[PDB]
């Protein structure tokens, strides 16, 4: 439900709106299905739809030196 607060309707309030049926996750990944405001969802581990904050790929500290 875009823009609403979940009171007004598992459940997870997001910056994009009230999301229902998706499990929140604290890991992060490439965006599989986009939702909004950095949130993305995937079908994942017995398996269910999860939702997570997008990772913009993996980080890399480039081994720069003078």
């Amino acid at each position: 439900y875009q823009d609403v607060n979940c009171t007004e309707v598992n459940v997870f309030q997001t910056r994009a709106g009230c999301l229902i049926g998706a499990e929140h996750v604290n890991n992060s990944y490439e965006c599989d299905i986009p939702i909004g405001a950095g949130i993305c969802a995937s079908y994942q581990t017995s398996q269910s739809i999860i939702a997570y904050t997008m990772s913009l790929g993996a980080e890399n500290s480039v081994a720069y030196s003078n």
């Binding site: 875009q2 823009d3 405001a37 913009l56 890399n60 500290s61 480039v62 081994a63 720069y64 030196s65």
Partner: protein, 411 residues
Amino acid sequence: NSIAIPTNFTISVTTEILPVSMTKTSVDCTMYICGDSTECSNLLLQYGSFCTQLNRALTGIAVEQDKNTQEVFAQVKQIYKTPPIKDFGGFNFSQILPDPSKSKRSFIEDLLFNKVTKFNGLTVLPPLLTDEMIAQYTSALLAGTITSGWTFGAGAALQIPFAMQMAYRFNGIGVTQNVLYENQKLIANQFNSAIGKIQDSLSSTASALGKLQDVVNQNAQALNTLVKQLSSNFGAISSVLNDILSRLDPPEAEVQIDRLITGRLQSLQTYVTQQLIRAAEIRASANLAATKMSECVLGQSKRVDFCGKGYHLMSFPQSAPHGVVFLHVTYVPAQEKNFTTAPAICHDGKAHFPREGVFVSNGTHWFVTQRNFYEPQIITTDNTFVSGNCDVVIGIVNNTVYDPLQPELDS
């Protein structure tokens, strides 16, 4: 037979500002037209597919604004992060890199974020990327651009010392590498100082960000106009549906609601038409910005006045609301001397020509120099090539070209 050659240059940090994406906006066209009036909502069925088509059009714009934003910024596979030690040979990026004390925006991205600036079915959707994720991408692009040059565009990023990367950008404008390392102190000071002046240019006045503020203003103007149009009478007895529904019998209330449906729908069509056209402009600006990312940031363009007004060295992106700012680092010449010149020079009855550069003298003894920074060298068989008999070249002049093998008369 006269040439002016620059003896000196300035680095410059010409700024360029491009919009990249409108506010993602959608209208429940039935709530806009009818405000939950069941009589109105039913009359709107008689008009058929327009309401569905307008939402398809606005949704096309809305998805496309994330795409536009993704095409500009997502030009990298990995989020590169800068080393802890800022050993960049004097170049002081501390204004353009993330300030971690906060959202990991840089200092200059904060100036840009500071300087910029109902619900009748009207809704604004959030962007897919948060402005913090955009600041991660502009940090990645920048951290690659600092640590690894163009190479992070061409697949795998490779470390290289920043002064060496600059020498291999100087060579990309025909200025020989030694004209960087022999001036490294002075080039560092010029670049650092120029970055300094950008902060004043952005802090002093709002008029620099005019392009982005026009896009914000035009959307707010169009939305305010679209909402005000609901109060427009369109030849009804009133612009409030409850008046019509209470004051009139159903057949007359319907004919009056039809005037309002017509006026409101014609307004909504007008608005969506403006937004499709405006979004086409923003798409063209985003594809341009995406290209300046791909050429100037991820590369070094040899397109004159594409990557800012000078000989181009490199560029840095900085995120801004609905837009992007490029800091195009450009070489520009700045002091020059007149010299007498000749297309070729003649020696031992044959024409000689410079391999690279131009021939010059200040009216006395002949020197070759590269053609973007005066660096007179003794003319030799090795900085030159022969091209047959002396005669046919218009305006050739004489010299004794030096033979570097001449001292070697031992065997």
